[PDB]
């Protein structure tokens, strides 16, 4: 059943059919199988050598794009006091979230790109430090605490004048793949969080401005992008239709009016015999 597919399938010419006991256009949806009726069996076709490629839909390409996963603005001045901590998650920005949620399980390495911008409340070319604090490790409490010495944690130092910082985080789940969805509880007691697999816990990204404060204040914004690569995906799923409500669950409400309202996903038309964008000549 498995095979290498590089282009869309060709079409073979077909002739008239009038065979007893043969009804290719009839099917039984109840079996759970999709119709296997071929164009050649439904109508008379010509031969077509199809050269259309299928590489742009490879999962690696579909998910292989750097998408915004974190955006944080804070004030850089004499006092988030010149630094912040972000509990890593891929559920805050809807474009990336919806795409990842088209799958049940995903295994991939993640390229992380960090873009920094500044505005005066000229622009100083500041040095920032982004430290990866794994689960169970202590997070910094001040712009200058000892934690920043980063003896074991991985830290990256970059300047606002340099290109965005970049590094790859390996597939680090304690399982063979990340659980995009998790129908279970994170603990042995009954009060644990539902829908959050502990196994997919990355940790915290701690970012600070290394420079001591200047005589005036600035607004610094840090944007983090993630691009999955070396991807393997399993069990595709129904796409999200209702607007997202929380980063911690799949709770839903729906838009106030169609489209995508809980009562009607598709916008209404006058009747089942009404053609919306009918060509009038």
């Amino acid at each position: 059943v498995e095979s290498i597919i590089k282009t869309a399938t060709d079409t073979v010419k077909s002739e008239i059919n009038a065979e007893l006991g043969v009804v290719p256009s009839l099917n039984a949806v109840e079996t759970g199988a999709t119709s296997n009726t071929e164009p050649e069996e439904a109508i008379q076709t010509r031969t077509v050598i199809n050269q259309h490629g299928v590489s742009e839909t490879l999962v690696e390409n579909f998910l292989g794009r750097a998408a915004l996963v974190s955006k944080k603005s804070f004030e850089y001045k004499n006092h988030h006091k010149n630094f912040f901590k972000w509990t890593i998650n891929t559920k805050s920005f809807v474009q990336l979230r919806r795409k990842l949620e088209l799958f049940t399980y995903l295994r991939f390495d993640a390229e992380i790109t960090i873009l920094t911008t500044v505005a005066v409340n000229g622009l100083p070319d500041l040095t920032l430090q982004a430290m990866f604090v794994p689960t169970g490790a202590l997070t910094p409490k001040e712009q200058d605490s000892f934690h920043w010495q980063s003896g074991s944690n991985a830290s990256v130092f970059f300047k606002i004048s340099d290109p965005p910082a970049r590094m790859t985080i390996p597939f680090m789940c304690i399982n063979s793949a990340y659980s995009v969805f998790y129908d279970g509880f994170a603990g042995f007691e009954k009060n644990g969080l539902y829908g959050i697999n502990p196994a997919d816990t990355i940790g915290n990204l701690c970012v600070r401005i290394v420079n001591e404060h200047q005589p005036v204040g600035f607004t610094v914004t840090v944007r983090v992008y993630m691009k999955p690569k070396h991807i393997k995906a399993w069990a595709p799923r129904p796409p999200r239709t209702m607007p997202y409500m929380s980063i911690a669950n799949a709770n839903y409400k729906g838009r106030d009016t169609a489209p995508n309202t809980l009562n009607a996903i598709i916008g209404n038309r006058a009747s089942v015999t009404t053609m919306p964008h009918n060509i009038v000549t």
Partner: protein, 49 residues
């Protein structure tokens, strides 16, 4: 015509399905118009606390 006996319901339903065949191909990736946000999702900001 739809023809039924007295004890069968006189209004019946059809369910229509659609799918692509294997001669299908898609190009030029873009962001889908089917999802969007105008505010932070609940808990997003709390991830920084």
């Amino acid at each position: 015509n739809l023809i039924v006996p007295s004890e069968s319901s006189d209004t019946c339903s059809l369910i229509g399905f659609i799918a692509a065949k294997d001669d299908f191909s898609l190009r030029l990736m873009r962001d889908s118009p089917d999802i969007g946000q105008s505010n932070h999702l609940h808990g997003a900001e709390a991830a920084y606390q």
